[PDB]
Ligand SMILES: N[C@H](CCC[C@H](N)C(=O)O)C(=O)O
Ligand SMILES: [Zn+2]
């Protein structure tokens with residue numbers, strides 16, 4: 083996991099309001115939480131103070147849509163064997179929580195049903211955790227903001243001013259953890275209370291569609307930020323339609339290794355003969371995105387590209403040495419010569435032509451005449467469209483080889 087800071091543009095403004103640590107994704111099958119932290123990171127600005135964000139605590143489990151591959155990570159904050167696979171991660175998390183710079187902690191979850199204080203039915207009862215705002219105790223002496231109960235009551239009131247359906251009404255849950263809630267005594271927020279941080283958990287119901295879960299998580303975040311007097315902005319209107327559009331953001335991309343950025347959405351469901359660097363374990367292959375919850379994971383003979391719990395495409399890998407010597411290629415684009423950098427996307431209105439290179443072979447994927455296809459003037463009508471990266475059939479791979487090594491890729495997009 084990674085921690086990402088959301089700070090004011092002026093460094094000196096960091097100490098002028100409180101500091102929140104915002105965490106989600108300790109359970110890998112709770113996408114409301116880690117899509118909310120993602121959207122917070124992408125679309126909000128913190129104007130004074132600081133919000134530190136760990137958008138997904140348990141990324142290996144998120145990648146396999148799993149509650150916890152190594153067990154429940156949210157029961158590992160008390161006793162823990164040093165040989166537990168997550169022991170180092172727990173120590174990193176405790177370190178972040180217990181830093182003197184942190185004042186408050188907000189931990190996001192998705193939970194089944196809808197909590198009610200007395201039993202109604204199977205979906206609505208006190209054993210359920212959905213749509214409630216949780217504290218371990220009413221007060222934490224020594225904290226900058228000791229009145230957890232007041233903060234919670236006000237945060238709940240804020241959320242409840244924006245209910246989508248009345249059944250979704252938020253309720254307070256005080257677990258009184260120090261008084262023998264054996265389970266909660268091993269969880270993250272109790273650890274935070276014991277470091278004299280004001281700590282809260284927000285749980286959105288799993289009965290809700292993802293965009294509604296994320297809506298309630300953002301409402302909780304905004305409610306707590308208002309209580310803390312951490313000033314913020316966001317670049318969208320907070321409603322489920324907007325949230326849906328921002329999760330399904332067609333501007334999202336992924337850059338795998340030194341390859342060109344590819345769009346996250348509307349990829350073909352399988353990409354064949356996809357070059358990946360050899361002798362590299364999948365978790366160590368670099369992958370960048372403008373989102374914060376994107377990754378690669380092995381599944382049988384494929385490598386999945388994941389956006390949270392969403393499967394964006396199935397890579398059928400071609401493991402090969404990535405020779406980094408080739409920096410750029412001379413291409414004619416729409417009659418005009420230019421030096422195109424390896425790893426870029428070039429837009430094409432009409433045509434292109436790759437100038438031949440002594441020791442480099444070009445394969446235009448979807449075009450045919452160990453193919454060498456430099457020296458051909460290529461138009462959209464020359465492509466077999468099923469080789470496109472995208473469902474829209476506009477984006478094609480050009481792969482370069484200095485045999486038997488991969489020298490890089492350029493994408494052409496027909497516009
Ligand atoms: N349903 C959650 C409750 C966690 C509440 C609080 N102790 C926290 O850590 O977030 C769980 O069983 O993990
Ligand atoms: Zn935005």
Ligand SMILES: [Zn+2]
Nearest residue numbers: 109112191192
């Ligand atoms: Zn959870």
Ligand SMILES: [Zn+2]
Nearest residue numbers: 240241243244
């Ligand atoms: Zn409001």
Ligand SMILES: [Zn+2]
Nearest residue numbers: 411412420421
């Ligand atoms: Zn040149």
